[PDB]
């Protein structure tokens, strides 16, 4: 498998960031791609073997270092808004025409202004009374409004355990004219009417936010959008 | 060496036959591949060809035939699943060249089949702190397609581990005085 | 074992000494090309091959890397069984019939070279020669040993003695094979 | 005196009757001991010496490794043979034939020729193929040329002319060199 750190990153024009990639498949060749809509996959840099580095098709503004056979990192000296893309790390046994194994991916968003970064509001919806009487199944539509960038991953937690059954989230998340406009994502949790009627059951819509670090400068009156989880809880009701 | 994909977005219903067109430029001994990319995930190889039989069988119940005269390697499936809704890329390679050229990518959306469709609008009770009011519609067949919001300060969202088979869409506005009633809706609706 | 044309695509070699390696392609016992692993370039032996044929040097670098990885595992499996030195066979002969005035080439065939670490130098009347000296890579053999060929472009004179100095670990003293017209 | 550990990998192709018969043998050698190999006629990796079973069993278990090696008969053996026809198999070098007396012995020096296929005969006067000639084996120069020296145990007479008949695929007619 291919492991990529981090998952999401927000940087200012001029900042430096390193993308660490590791594989446990004893592969010689390691790659660094960038996925853009309409363009597809564009190779930045690639290491055919340990202690060997070669330029791809888009190597401008990037630099790599192959530490060993398992690790290969992608370093950015100065961040540019043109580098706003999701980066994927790949690996093959020895040649480029071998089965390529890809990582989870690292979404990157480079901005000129750090004032347009907002954490979302966890508005946990209480299942409708008319829904329990008709379809006999409770639905919790936890909505997120006013967030930038799309560096948000939602997870439903029921009684301390992360659930996936009944979870319905949007694939892609207000103003169509604005270039730095905030989007809206909807997530629904469908459960049985008997499960919601029990008051001992706990429901929590967890939102993992990937913002600025502690070392980053902030000179605004509003709260700093740091790497903190935004979560709201809801308890079961019989009537 | 290059690869071309004439389709950019294909919309099909669950169970129906699939055919993803992909044609390559040139090659003395070509290396043709097919990769699947799920949203929030990386690329995964489905099937490959370099030598042997023209018809190659891959993972997730996919098959492809290599046409040398037509210079194409089209991916086909007899019955499509809801899980197959992802972006598909076809790569090209050569024996004497350590290089791989990936395609632009074709987006695929598979609408899940509903055996018992019951389309109905529901008045949902919004929170006290939130200025917005919410309403939703659940269980609608592949024949019905929901269109984008007409009003600017009105927002609609689409769409949707084996419970339940049905899917739902949310339509809400910060106006609070929003009424559920819509572009091309089924005549039989409850509430 | 019997065939009209025998080819090797290619002869991959890696050894602990150095550590050094070699990658070359052969056809009917003759070397097509060799990949200069340090300079990362393909060097074809014929002018016909340079104009109509090409090879990606990246294939060699990745193959030698697999050979580097494989050698370390087999050493532990064999329980550090080192390569035993072999006695090489040296033969010196002219390319064309020797005639005073006509330009000729002296060939020094060094057969049964194992391990593939050898120093082949030329000597004219006791003095070392470097001018007009060309050397081929290690050519593979069926018994998994190697053979190297050294050339010396010269003009045969009335009195000029030539010797081929071969330095190998299989020999205590450097072997000298004399040649004279 | 210095310690050395050698490793060899030979990906060989054997061609017979052009493209009709083709055989691949990937030989994995530790020093001079071949421990593992893959024969196209066999279809699977096999151990040659007791140092080969862990490698052969591991390579046969992996589906991607077996599928790649089986496909190498077309991707490298059959692919390079098509490229070989345009250059190497089309290469024809005409030999240089000269006779030098070494004075009761004649040496027929056939110099610089490609391919290896050659037929040299010694004739006494006219249409009398001699059976007392010693020919050296096919000498490989290494620079894509070959040479062969054919010695003849000769006894000269007043009116004796010795001819050397050389046949090579590069010539449309054989080379005849005389000696008086």
């Amino acid at each position: 498998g291919v492991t990529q750190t981090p998952k999401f990153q927000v940087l200012k024009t001029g900042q430096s960031m390193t993308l660490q990639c590791a594989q446990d498949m004893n592969h010689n060749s390691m790659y660094w791609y960038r996925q853009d809509p309409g363009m597809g996959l564009r190779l930045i840099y690639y290491s055919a073997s340990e202690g060997t580095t070669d330029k791809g098709e888009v190597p401008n503004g990037y630099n790599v270092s192959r530490l060993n056979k398992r690790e290969f990192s992608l370093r950015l000296e100065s961040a540019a808004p043109s580098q706003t893309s999701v980066y994927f790390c790949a690996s093959s046994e020895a040649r480029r025409y071998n089965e390529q194994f890809f990582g989870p991916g690292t979404r990157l968003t480079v901005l000129e202004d750090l004032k347009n970064v907002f954490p979302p509001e966890v508005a946990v919806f209480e299942p409708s009374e008319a829904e329990i009487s008709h379809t006999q199944k409770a639905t919790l539509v936890c909505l997120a409004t006013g967030f930038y960038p799309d560096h948000v991953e939602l997870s439903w937690w029921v009684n301390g355990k992360e659930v996936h059954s009944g979870v319905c989230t949007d694939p892609q998340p207000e103003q169509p004219a604005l270039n730095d406009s905030r989007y809206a994502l909807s997530s629904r949790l469908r459960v049985s009417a008997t499960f919601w009627q029990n008051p001992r059951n706990h429901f929590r819509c967890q939102v993992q936010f990937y913002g600025l670090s502690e070392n980053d400068e902030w000179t605004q009156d509003r709260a700093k959008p740091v790497t903190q989880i935004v979560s709201a809880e809801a308890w079961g009701r019989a009537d | 060496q290059s690869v071309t994909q004439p389709d950019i977005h294909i919309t099909v219903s669950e169970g129906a036959s699939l055919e993803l067109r992909c044609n390559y430029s040139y090659g003395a001994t070509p290396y043709l591949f097919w990769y699947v990319q799920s949203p929030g995930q990386g690329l995964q190889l489905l099937l490959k060809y370099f030598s042997g039989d023209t018809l190659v069988q891959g993972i997730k119940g996919f098959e492809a035939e290599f046409k040398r005269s037509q210079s194409s390697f089209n991916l086909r499936k007899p019955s499509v699943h809801w899980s197959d809704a992802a972006e598909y890329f076809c790569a090209v390679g050569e024996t004497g060249a350590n290089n791989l050229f990936f395609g632009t990518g074709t987006r695929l959306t598979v609408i899940p089949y509903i055996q018992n469709p019951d389309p109905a609008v529901y008045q949902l009770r919004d929170s006290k702190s939130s200025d917005k009011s919410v309403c939703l519609f659940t269980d609608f067949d592949s024949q019905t397609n929901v269109s984008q919001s007409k009003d600017s300060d009105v927002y609609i969202t689409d769409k949707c581990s084996m419970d339940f088979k049905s899917n739902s869409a949310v339509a809400w506005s910060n106006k609070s005085d929003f009424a559920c009633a819509n572009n091309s809706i089924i005549p039989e609706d409850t509430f | 074992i019997v065939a009209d044309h025998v080819a090797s695509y290619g002869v991959n070699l890696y050894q602990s000494y150095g550590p050094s390696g070699q990658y070359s392609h052969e056809f009917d016992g003759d070397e097509e090309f060799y990949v200069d692993l340090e300079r990362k370039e393909t060097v074809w032996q014929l002018p016909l091959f340079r104009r109509f044929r090409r090879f990606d040097p990246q294939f060699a670098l990745t193959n030698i890397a697999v050979l580097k990885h494989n050698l370390n595992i087999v050493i532990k499996r064999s329980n550090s069984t080192a390569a035993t030195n072999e006695v090489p066979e040296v033969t010196v002969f002219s390319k064309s019939p020797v005639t005073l005035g006509q330009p000729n080439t002296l060939i020094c065939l060094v057969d049964n070279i194992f391990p593939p670490v050898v120093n082949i130098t030329w000597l004219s009347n006791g003095h070392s020669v470097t001018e007009g000296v060309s050397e081929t890579s290690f050519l593979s053999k069926s018994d998994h040993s190697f053979f190297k060929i050294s050339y010396l472009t010269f003009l045969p004179s009335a009195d000029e003695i030539y010797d081929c100095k071969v330095e190998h670990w299989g020999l205590d003293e450097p072997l000298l094979k004399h040649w004279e017209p | 005196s210095p310690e050395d550990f050698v490793y060899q990998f030979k990906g060989m192709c054997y061609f017979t009757n052009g493209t009709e018969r083709v055989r691949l043998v990937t030989r994995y050698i530790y020093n001079r001991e071949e421990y593992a190999r893959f024969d196209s006629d066999v279809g699977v990796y096999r151990a040659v010496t007791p140092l080969g079973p862990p490698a052969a069993e591991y390579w046969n278990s992996q589906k991607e490794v077996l599928e790649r090696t089986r496909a190498e008969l077309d991707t490298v053996c059959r692919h390079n043979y098509q490229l070989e026809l345009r250059t190497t198999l089309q290469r024809r070098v005409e030999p240089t034939v000269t006779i030098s007396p070494s004075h009761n012995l004649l040496v027929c020096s056939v110099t610089d020729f490609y391919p290896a296929q050659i037929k040299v005969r010694w004739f006494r006067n006219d249409q009398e193929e001699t059976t007392g000639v010693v020919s050296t084996p096919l000498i490989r120069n290494g620079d894509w040329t070959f040479q062969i020296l054919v010695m003849l145990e000769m006894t000269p007479q007043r009116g004796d002319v010795y001819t050397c008949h050389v046949e090579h695929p590069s010539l449309q007619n054989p080379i005849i060199v005389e000696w008086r």
Binding site: - | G96, A97 | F55, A60, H69 | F9, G11, C77
Partner: peptide
């Protein structure tokens, strides 16, 4: 021009 084909050696078991 079409490049020359090459034999890929199988990697030994690191375990």
């Amino acid at each position: 021009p079409s490049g020359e084909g090459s034999f890929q050696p199988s990697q030994e078991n690191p375990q």
